[PDB]
């Protein structure tokens, strides 16, 4: 069985992880 929340959240989560990597690349000890 498929869930709308799972299919939406997977791509959105991918975008969020990409953003985290974007900031991490320009931030070593900054949080």
């Amino acid at each position: 069985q498929w869930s709308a929340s799972i299919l939406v959240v997977v791509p959105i989560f991918l975008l969020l992880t990409g953003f985290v990597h974007l900031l991490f690349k320009l931030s070593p000890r900054l949080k």
Binding site: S3, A4, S5, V8, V9, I12, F13, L15, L16, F19, L22, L23
Partner: protein
């Protein structure tokens, strides 16, 4: 049943919240830049 109860489900609030977070991150990067 008053008003669309299904419109208060999990799949509607979760994406908008995440989208807001992402937009906040890019806005933060832009502000910090220069």
């Amino acid at each position: 049943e008053e008003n669309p109860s299904l419109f208060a489900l999990e799949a509607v609030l979760i994406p908008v919240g995440t989208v807001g977070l992402i937009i906040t991150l890019i806005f933060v990067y832009f502000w910090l830049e220069r």
